[PDB]
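Why this split exists: single-chain examples teach little about how molecules sit against one another. For that reason, every record in the complexes split bundles all components of an assembly together and asks for one structure covering all of them. Below is a record exactly as it appears in the raw files.
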Amino acid sequence: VMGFKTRYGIGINPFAESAAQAPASRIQSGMPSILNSLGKNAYFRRVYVKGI
Amino acid sequence: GGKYRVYIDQYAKQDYFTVGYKGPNEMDAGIYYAPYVALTPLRGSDPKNFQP
C-alpha cells in the first residue's frame, strides 16, 4: 500500500483588495475566497483578447 | 529505630498502618511478584490510512 501527503495552506496580501479603508472586525481570514478576494486583488489584472 | 523500613501508602483509604515481614530469601516474603515478560511494545500500522 503506498502514497504521499503535503501541507502548505494558502494566503493573500492583507492590502490586496485595495477597496476599503479597513476590513471588518479587525480580524479576517488570509485565505482567499468569494467574499475576500475574487475579482479584488490589486496585484493582478485580466484582459480577454479577440480577433488576432 | 533502624529496625523497620517505613513506606507510605499514598493512597491509604483512610488512616492505618500495616506491619510486615520480609526475610533475606524470596521465600521469606509471604507474597510473590513473578514477572515473565514486560513492556513488550505493540507496534504496527494501518496502511489504509498509514496511521501507526
